[PDB]
Design a protein around this ligand. Structure first.
Ligand SMILES: CCCCCCCC/C=C\CCCCCCCC(=O)O[C@H](COC(=O)CCCCCCCCCCCCCCC)COP(=O)([O-])OCC[N+](C)(C)C
Ligand SMILES: CCCCCCCC/C=C\CCCCCCCC(=O)O[C@H](COC(=O)CCCCCCCCCCCCCCC)COP(=O)([O-])OCC[N+](C)(C)C
Ligand SMILES: CCCCCCCC/C=C\CCCCCCCC(=O)O[C@H](COC(=O)CCCCCCCCCCCCCCC)COP(=O)([O-])OCC[N+](C)(C)C
Ligand SMILES: CCCCCCCC/C=C\CCCCCCCC(=O)O[C@H](COC(=O)CCCCCCCCCCCCCCC)COP(=O)([O-])OCC[N+](C)(C)C
Ligand SMILES: Nc1ncnc2c1ncn2[C@@H]1O[C@H](COP(=O)(O)OP(=O)(O)CP(=O)(O)O)[C@@H](O)[C@H]1O
Ligand SMILES: Nc1ncnc2c1ncn2[C@@H]1O[C@H](COP(=O)(O)OP(=O)(O)CP(=O)(O)O)[C@@H](O)[C@H]1O
Ligand SMILES: [Mg+2]
Ligand SMILES: [Zn+2]
Ligand SMILES: [Zn+2]
Lengths: 548, 242
């Protein structure tokens, strides 16, 4: 039966759990073709790498399984979104659906097209001159030498840039807005069910999210993206005895809770006719909450600012110049270069503050003692005294001494006079030593330390992956007894993707068919208990007496 | 050879050969490897510098056109920033190599109008170009040098703390006096496998002892199961003293 085993090997998945006994149990299940194909996508691999980096670097030993389950649920939701985007009033509706799916499918190609349009606009706008007399007060005109080509073109490119910006903002609205709504709804539902954020305690102050989440609780359309539609009933059953049933029911909407019970069976509702009903069927409060959540996201605000600048670029100005800095951050290598500068911005701003304090102190000292040397004029009877006032002297110091690179003595008069010569020499030496030498070396060392910090973190993350199992507590030295034992352990017995596909199979299967082991795993998942993981044991260690 | 043939024509074509051969020096190769290590980061740094200079040139052309006069004689037609291309060329030629910003070469900001804006412009020019973007270039080279030091240290430590053939560490072999040296000189030795491959290649298939014929058969099928890969003679026969 070798051909049977080789044919069904990609579709066969195994996992090792611990449940219903004190022994390790293996479960065999089926892996779908489309889920395996979706798992191999580069975006899914990049999200997995980011999740692993976040867990290894900043995540603790505890609560790792909760983050793993959250990442698995996010992956399931991404697969569902990718499945739905995969490809007369009814004809217009289906054309709108097809156009939205086409816009969602191609998102980064339009982004690169917008970058190309911005580069072309900048290249055409390079040829731009100013004159005192109108061509053929001052006027601005392009001496392009090619008459009638560029002035018409840059207008086609302006319209195309506006259109592409609108299409990208629409694609972002229909594409990744759904995930953050699902994540927010899932987090709120879990906090309500298990933490009692609004039932037992209250998030009264220091949270803008806690106050903003109160509007969606009373809405009947609370479960929209989250899979469980019975969270309100679970909360009511959990907190119905300790707290008043009426109060908890009223706080979570749920009008006519007595009529919700099917003991009445008085009448059956009739279907309404779907004409003009769409105006009344919307929930104003829920849409307001969703719009606020969308307005909270940083990338939506970035795209709105991009569209605002694109619209302002139609007005004859140079508003298209900033778009180059808007898109250049999207480059990955430039992002890693800029991350080191962004790593220690706080140290930089306190360094600038300390520099300002030092310059203020030296300016005060110069105003008290060295007022006579701050004359910057050559013509006789000179009224141009820089340090006659403290504000003017401070401005002069901040403008000249910082950018001089050699101190204030190179710009101030000569210390050749006998009076106050050594004091001014010491002043200049301290100015050169304390400002130019040390405070710039600190700035350079912060960036170099940030680079070393990022290299050490990457090395530690890679070493942790190579020298650990990430699921069990057994090192690779025990598995290295047999030839290629560690590879077999990390590919077949664990594999992570195996647990992901097991969760896929459990979600797809209805509660009716759950095999006993699968039903037990589902029961542990419903109660948020993570004791089914091995967590320090494997099949080999439990059965070490036998060879297998 | 092409440059050597072109050197016969009376010119200075023989000057480049010095740079052609100086890379052959090993120490110079290790010095130049750190600069060659992060060339991509350097070229995107130059691109970002060009974008920043272009943006500042655009800002100066929109607001500070009057200060870019570089002449002393009266009725001066030498205006640098009258055109965007000329202003960009002037900025790329002067501001990058100035080391103190554009305010040292531009007119005095002593005028009341647009004084604070020009002061902020000069401060941002000094802070964003000279200070940070050169520190990034220096830090890339320093990070490369250290990265090469860490890799060499890791390579040497891996050689000293492993067997490179088996999966057993040196701590188990260090039970007997000089056990690890005996393991790494006689039981493995690599050169021993090289000489075994030499002997198998030299010997004809006719003459091929049973074990040697089995090793040859595994080599023909590209199967590497004849290596120990986690075991040795001592661990298999640990019950006996030998
Ligand atoms: C983010 C920051 C970017 C911009 C900052 C905020 C700006 C947004 C908002 C402020 C202004 C809102 C729009 C009102 C009119 C425009 C205005 O006041 O300024 C214009 C300045 O003219 C310009 O071109 C502005 C300067 C160019 C540099 C900006 C980005 C490039 C480098 C920065 C990269 C960072 C006024 O000119 P105008 O009199 O309108 O001329 C047209 C007049 N007719 C003849 C066509 C009727
Ligand atoms: C701190 C170090 C020093 C601080 C300043 C000295 C404190 C005051 C004591 C002497 C003042 C005094 O009355 O005597 C004077 C002579 O004494 C001097 O001229 C002293 C000059 C001091 C500056 C030297 C540079 C040191 C390094 C700089 C580092 C800067 C700090 C930065 C640190 C990060 C004579 O008195 P007068 O002047 O005839 O009468 C005073 C009346 N007015 C003029 C004041 C109105
Ligand atoms: C490395 C990559 C390329 C390196 C350089 C690129 C090579 C290009 C490629 C080959 C150029 C075509 C050959 C035609 C003749 C040469 C030419 O164009 O003008 C010649 C200039 O010849 C020079 O000396 C040029 C300057 C010297 C620089 C070269 C290396 C120095 C450091 C560079 C860094 C490396 C003029 O020739 P001529 O005046 O007629 O002299 C003969 C006069 N008689 C005999 C007729 C009387
Ligand atoms: C971005 C920062 C700001 C960018 C420019 C400001 C945006 C335009 C809005 C104001 C323009 C306007 O009409 O008001 C003007 C006063 O406004 C000014 O003079 C503003 C000068 C700004 C320079 C600050 C230097 C900061 C560093 C910059 C580095 C760049 C970013 C690089 C960083 C990576 C007066 O109006 P007007 O001039 O009489 O009429 C407009 C008509 N023309 C003459 C303009 C055609
Ligand atoms: N359960 C598990 N435990 C520990 N490590 C695991 C693991 N599942 C995978 N890995 C680790 O991941 C490493 C290899 O996966 P990697 O991250 O290289 O995938 P990849 O994105 O590079 C696809 P490929 O390598 O086939 O091109 C291995 O060192 C292995 O230890
Ligand atoms: N099979 C093997 N396993 C592990 N290490 C081995 C090995 N064969 C050789 N070595 C390693 O080589 C290391 C030192 O030898 P090295 O590679 O430095 O040779 P070498 O070029 O310095 C010649 P010499 O030492 O005679 O001057 C030893 O510590 C040993 O661990
Ligand atoms: Mg170190
Ligand atoms: Zn394991
Ligand atoms: Zn060995």
């Amino acid at each position: 039966a070798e051909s049977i085993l080789e044919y069904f090997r990609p579709y066969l998945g195994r996992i090792e759990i611990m449940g219903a006994s004190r022994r390790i149990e293996r479960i065999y299940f089926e892996i779908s073709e489309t889920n395996r194909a979706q798992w191999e996508m580069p975006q899914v691999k990049e999200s997995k790498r980011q999740f692993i980096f976040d867990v290894v670097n900043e995540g603790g030993e505890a609560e790792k399984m909760e983050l793993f389950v959250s990442f698995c649920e996010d992956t399931i939701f991404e697969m569902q979104i990718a499945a739905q985007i995969s490809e007369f009033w009814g004809e217009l509706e289906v054309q709108r659906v097809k156009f939205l799916n086409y816009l969602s499918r191609n998102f980064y190609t339009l982004r690169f097209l917008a970058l190309f349009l911005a580069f072309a606009i900048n290249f055409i706008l390079l040829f731009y001159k100013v004159s005192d007399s109108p061509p053929g007060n001052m006027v601005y005109y392009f001496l392009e030498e090619s008459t009638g080509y560029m002035e018409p073109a840059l207008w086609c490119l302006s319209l195309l840039h506006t259109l592409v910006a609108f299409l990208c903002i629409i694609g972002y609205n229909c594409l990744k807005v759904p995930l953050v709504i699902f994540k927010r709804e899932k987090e709120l539902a879990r906090k309500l069910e298990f933490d009692g954020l609004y039932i037992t305690e209250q998030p009264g102050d220091d949270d803008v999210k806690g106050q903003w989440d109160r509007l969606v609780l009373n809405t009947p359309s609370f479960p929209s993206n989250y899979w469980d539609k019975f969270v309100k009933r679970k909360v009511l059953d959990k907190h119905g005895d300790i707290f008043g049933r009426e109060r908890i029911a009223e706080l979570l909407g749920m009008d006519l809770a007595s009529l919700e019970i099917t003991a009445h069976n008085e009448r059956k509702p009739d279907p309404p006719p779907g004409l003009l009903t769409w105006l009344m069927s919307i929930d104003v409060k829920y849409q307001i909450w969703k719009f606020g959540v969308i307005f909270t996201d940083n990338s939506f605000l970035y795209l709105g600012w991009y569209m605002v600048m694109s619209l302002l670029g139609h007005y004859n100005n140079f508003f298209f110049a900033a778009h180059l800095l808007d898109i250049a951050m999207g480059v990955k290598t430039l992002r890693t270069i800029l991350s080191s500068v962004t790593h220690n911005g706080k140290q930089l701003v306190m360094t600038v503050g300390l520099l300002a304090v030092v310059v203020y102190l030296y300016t005060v000292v110069a105003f008290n003692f060295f007022r006579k040397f701050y004359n910057k004029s050559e013509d006789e009877d000179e009224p141009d005294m820089k340090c006659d006032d403290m504000m003017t002297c401070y401005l002069f110091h901040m403008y000249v001494g910082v950018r001089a690179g050699g101190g204030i003595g190179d710009e101030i008069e000569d210390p050749a006079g006998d009076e106050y010569e050594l004091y001014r020499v010491v002043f200049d030496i301290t100015f050169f030593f304390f400002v130019i030498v040390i405070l710039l070396a600190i700035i350079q060392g912060l960036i170099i330390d940030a680079f070393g910090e990022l290299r050490d973190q990457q090395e530690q993350v890679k070493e942790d992956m190579e020298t650990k199992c990430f699921i069990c507590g057994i090192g690779s030295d025990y598995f290295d007894t047999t030839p290629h034992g560690f590879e077999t352990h990390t590919l077949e017995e664990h594999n992570l993707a195996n647990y992901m596909f097991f969760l896929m199979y459990l979600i797809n299967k209805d509660e009716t068919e759950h095999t006993g082991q699968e039903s037990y795993v589902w029961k542990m998942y419903q109660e948020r208990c993570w004791d089914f993981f091995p967590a320090g044991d494997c099949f080999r260690k439990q059965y070490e007496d036998q060879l297998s």
